[PDB]
């Protein structure tokens, strides 16, 4: 497939995707707010369009890799007259509802729309470890699937344009929160003179074990939460809530951020007040669903 | 060995540790606030002492597996007169400073003290995957190391009794925060009718990749944070902050807990206000150290 592709947005992801697409034999026309930044991919075979209009008109497939969806409007507003008959694939972070409204804005300018959420950093783009979530019209996904597969294995979730965005925001909810916690833990160990080079491999060593730990003793949290099975036999909210109290205390004494640990503390405290101290930690999901 | 051990606290950890110790040939004398709960381990060879005093006097080594350190005072107050010449190994969660003061309380009652933090769930106790952090007097750790190894690989951190407690709280800072985030993400996907049985394997699938993702493009976060190297080449705080904004927005719309994502959002917001939008995400640690 040598389908001509347009890609707008040349951050690390944009550049990595351009390169994978070029290497697969697709002519790629790029445009960036900062044209200088295109020099790299242009040396690798990308064609730099002078204008958004020219970039849009070069391909039936327009990929956006921008910081947010406001950026899509900013870049495409001058080109709205040239959208008809093309597919917009937006690979950018934003709210699910912004995304759904953006899909309708594409349709009304005569374009089809697909949502994508890329699940790996730029060096892993186009490798066997790469994967991307997609939602939107099935026929649109199918028409371009072979081209999109170059960036990463697609995981089509269905027709709601909001859905692959919600999945992305859910995944990044885990990922960013985990990262903030790693920095929080590092900070805490830092106050007793432990360096980050010592602390971070300890913390990562533990995180690597987390899938196994969650499965020990034949727990299966998903089905359990669906079934409303929260049995406390191997760990209770009381016992885990206490630890959450201990982390807040240690953090207070360490002079570091209290908001992250107090949020966690509040999940346990809520479940206890609601009378489920004796349940497994999965029960905190009830309080989370109903503030 | 065949060294006699006392273990107090027969939650799942206490019971799993008793069993591993029995299986290794150690005579184990147990005591629990609720004696009924000892039936299982007694069937497996444990001896149930009638009284705390009697349990303490049965061995040179007293292991405590209790919800917190207040529980240690509660259980051992009547036995303070029988502590002299024995080692207390506390394998309970609490603050580092509570732990340090508890060590001094043991010394005052004529006992030695070791801090432990068990890093695996009860089904993994006494297996190759098990490990435990220890801090306190080197001579005391050495005297009992061969007994303690039955529970899990020891990771001795040094002489400060607070240190293995701080390490435990740091590790549980990551672990609990991660778990809360998984429940948060599950809740969020739940509001579009995605079940936890569908969502949790997606989220865990991602979390499994997190060590690799952090190392992509030759980042090595620990040394970088120690060196103050926060280069924004492959990901910026601006870009990650925006996603954190998007998670908050999606969560507001989803009607779910805002405290957890807003804590994460604030880490990015702070770094940006302080003028490091362009840096890698590791830079959030500065704001976390200095609220
Ligand atoms: N980096 C990662 O590892 C990673 C992984 C998966 C997903 N993502 C997502 O992928 C997208 C791209 O991320 P990235 O890290 O490659 O880059 P980024 O730093 O988000 O920037 C990407 C592009 O956005 C452009 N831009 C931003 N605001 C704009 C506006 N108002 N008008 C015009 N252009 C605008 C930048 O223009 P200039 O070049 O002119 O500044 C740049 O070309 C983001 O939505 C991100 O959340 C990133
Ligand atoms: N569960 C895990 O996966 C895990 C893994 C690592 C670390 N830990 C840590 O290991 C420790 C034990 O946790 P666990 O889950 O096995 O059990 P737990 O639910 O924390 O309770 C353990 C024991 O604490 C006793 N206890 C609590 N308050 C007491 C008090 N005031 N006076 C007397 N006894 C008291 C209970 O007595 P009763 O039996 O009479 O109620 C029970 O025997 C905790 O500090 C926990 O953070 C747990
Ligand atoms: C169902 N999750 C378990 C996994 C192990 C664990 C739990 C609670 C506290 C500490 C733990 O391991 C360090 C519950
Ligand atoms: C090492 N920092 C990168 C890792 C991957 C990543 C970042 C930000 C957003 C999404 C990402 O991958 C899913 C920062």
Kindly write down the DSSP assignment for every residue of A28-81, as one continuous string.
EEEE-SSGGGGHHHHHTT-EE-SSHHHHHHT-SEEEE--SSHHHHHHHHGGGGG
List CB contacts (< 8 A) between A102 and chain B: none
Phi, psi (5° rounding) for residue B275?
90, 30
Enter the tokens of residue A256: 């570091």
Whether residues B172 and B149 share a domain: the answer is: no
Give every CB contact of residue A111 below 8 A, 6+ residues apart in sequence. A62, A83, A84, A85, A86, A87, A88
Alpha helices in chain B (DSSP H): 12-23, 39-43, 52-56, 69-76, 96-108, 138-148, 161-190, 196-208, 210-215, 221-227, 237-254, 259-273, 284-289
Burial bucket for residue B198 (CB in 10 Å: 0-12, 13-18, 19+)? middle
Whether residues A69 and A175 share a domain: the answer is: no
Give every CB contact of residue B250 below 8 A, 6+ residues apart in sequence. A95, A96, A166, A169, B188
Whether residues A118 and A258 share a domain: the answer is: no
Q: Which mutation among A121, A131, A155, A178 tests ligand 4's pocket best, with the greatest number of atoms within 8 A of CB?
A: A121
Q: Which of B264, B263, B256 is nearest to B186 (CA)?
A: B256
Whether residues A99 and A213 share a domain: the answer is: no
List CB contacts (< 8 A) between A152 and chain B: none
Q: Please indicate whether, in this complex, the C-beta atoms of A210 and B97 are within 8 angstroms of each other.
A: no
CA distance A109 to B93: 60
Give every CB contact of residue A213 below 8 A, 6+ residues apart in sequence. B120, B121, B124
Burial bucket for residue B261 (CB in 10 Å: 0-12, 13-18, 19+)? buried
Domain range for B240 is: 166-289
**Which ligand 4 atom lies nearest to the CA of residue B215?**
1
- Ligand 3 centroid to Cα of residue B127, in Å, is 15
Enter the tokens of residue B75: 């259980």
> How many angstroms is the resolution?
1.9
**CB of B38 within 8 A of CB of B10?**
yes
CA distance readout (Å), A167 to A42, A157, B193, B199: 33, 9, 12, 9
Domain final residue pick, A159, A177, A203: A159
Q: Which of A34, A71, A78, A35 is nearest to A56 (CA)?
A: A78
Residue A260's H or E segment, with its range, is helix A259-273
Whether residues A138 and A246 share a domain: the answer is: no
Question: What is the torsional sign of CA A239, A244, A245, A246?
Answer: positive
Elucidation method: X-ray
Tokens 């004796």 appear where? Answer: A278
Residue-by-residue DSSP string for B99-140: HHHHHHHHHHTT-EEEEEEE-S-GGGTTSTT-EEEEES-HHH
Whether residues A62 and A202 share a domain: the answer is: no
CA distance readout (Å), B94 to A247, A248, A249, B218, B235: 8, 10, 9, 37, 37
Q: Which residue of A has its CA nearest to B164?
A: A189
**CB of A269 within 8 A of CB of A276?**
no
Question: What is the torsional sign of CA B20, B21, B25, B27?
Answer: negative
Whether residues B147 and B211 share a domain: the answer is: no
Q: What's the order of all strands across the beta sheet hosting B5-8? A: B47-48, B28-31, B5-8, B61-64, B87-90, B112-118, B131-135, B153-156
Whether residues A36 and A125 share a domain: the answer is: yes
CA distance A11 to B165: 42
HSE-CB for A242 with a 13 A CA cutoff: 16
Enter the tokens of residue B222: 């620990």
For chain A, how many structural domains are there in total?
2
Q: Please indicate whether, in this complex, the C-beta atoms of B253 and A210 are within 8 angstroms of each other.
A: no
Q: Specify which residues A76 forms β-bridges with.
A: none
Whether residues B103 and B173 share a domain: the answer is: no
Ligand (nearest to CA of A174): 4
CATH number at residue A19: 3.40.50.720
How many residues make up chain B in this entry?
A: 291
**CB of B156 within 8 A of CB of A252?**
no
Rg (CA), chain A: 23
Domain final residue pick, A159, A186, A213: A159
Is the distance from the beta carbon of residue B121 to the nearest atom of ligand 3 less than 6 Å? yes
Domain final residue pick, A112, A136, A159: A159
**CB of A272 within 8 A of CB of A248?**
no
**CB of B200 within 8 A of CB of A214?**
no
**CB of A56 within 8 A of CB of A76?**
yes
Q: Specify which residues A117 forms β-bridges with.
A: A133
Phi, psi (5° rounding) for residue B72?
-65, -45
**Which ligand 1 atom lies nearest to the CA of residue B242?**
47
> Is B256 at the interface with chain A, CB within 8 A?
yes
Question: What is the torsional sign of CA B19, B23, B24, B30?
Answer: positive
DSSP state of B50: S
Q: Using DSSP bridges, classify how beta strands B131-135 and B87-90 pair: parallel, antiparallel or unpaired.
A: unpaired
Supply the residue whose CA is at minimum distance from atom 11 of ligand 3: B121
Whether residues B147 and B208 share a domain: the answer is: no
CATH number at residue A244: 1.10.1040.10
Q: Which of A176, A179, A261 is nearest to B291 (CA)?
A: A261
Which A positions 175-234 lie with beta carbon below 8 A of chain B?
175-190, 192, 195-204, 206-214, 216-217, 221-226, 233-234
**Which ligand 2 atom lies nearest to the CA of residue B66?**
24
Q: Using DSSP bridges, classify how beta strands B61-64 and B5-8 pair: parallel, antiparallel or unpaired.
A: parallel
Which B positions 139-178 lie with beta carbon below 8 A of chain A?
160, 162-163, 166-167, 169-178
Enter the tokens of residue B198: 């569908």
Whether residues B149 and B173 share a domain: the answer is: no
Whether residues B88 and B187 share a domain: the answer is: no
**CB of B181 within 8 A of CB of B244?**
no
CA distance readout (Å), A116 to A7, A65, A134, A173: 14, 10, 5, 17
How many Å lie between the alpha carbon of A226 and the closest alpha carbon of chain B? 6
């Amino acid at each position: 497939d040598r389908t001509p592709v347009t890609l707008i947005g040349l951050g690390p992801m944009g550049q990595a995707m351009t390169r994978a697409l070029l290497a697969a034999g697709h002519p790629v026309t790029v445009w960036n707010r900062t044209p200088a930044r295109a020099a790299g991919v242009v040396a690798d075979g990308a064609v730099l369009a002078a204008s958004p209009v020219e970039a849009v008109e070069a391909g039936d497939l327009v990929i956006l890799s921008l910081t947010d969806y406001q950026a899509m409007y900013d870049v495409l507003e001058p080109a709205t007259g040239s959208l008809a008959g093309r597919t917009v694939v937006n690979l950018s972070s934003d709210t699910p509802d912004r995304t759904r409204a953006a899909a309708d804005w594409a349709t009304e300018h005569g374009a089809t729309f697909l949502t994508g959420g890329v699940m790996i950093p730029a060096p892993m783009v186009g490798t066997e470890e790469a994967y991307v979530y997609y939602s939107g019209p099935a026929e649109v996904f199918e028409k371009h699937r072979t081209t999109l597969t170059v960036i990463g294995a697609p995981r089509y979730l269905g027709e709601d344009t909001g859905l692959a965005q919600l999945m992305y925001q859910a995944q990044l909810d885990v990922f960013l929160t985990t990262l903030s916690s790693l920095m929080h833990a590092t900070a805490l160990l830092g106050t007793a003179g432990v360096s980050a080079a010592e602390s971070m491999p300890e913390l990562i060593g533990m995180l690597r074990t987390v899938p196994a730990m969650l499965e020990a003793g034949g727990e299966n949290p998903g089905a359990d939460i669906d079934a409303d099975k929260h049995p406390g036999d191997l760990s209770t909210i009381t016992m885990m809530g206490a630890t959450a109290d201990h982390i807040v205390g240690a953090s207070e004494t360490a002079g570091i951020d209290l908001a992250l640990p107090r949020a966690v503390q509040a999940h346990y405290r809520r479940a206890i007040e609601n009378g489920h101290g004796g349940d497994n930690w999965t029960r905190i999901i009830d309080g989370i669903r109903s503030p």
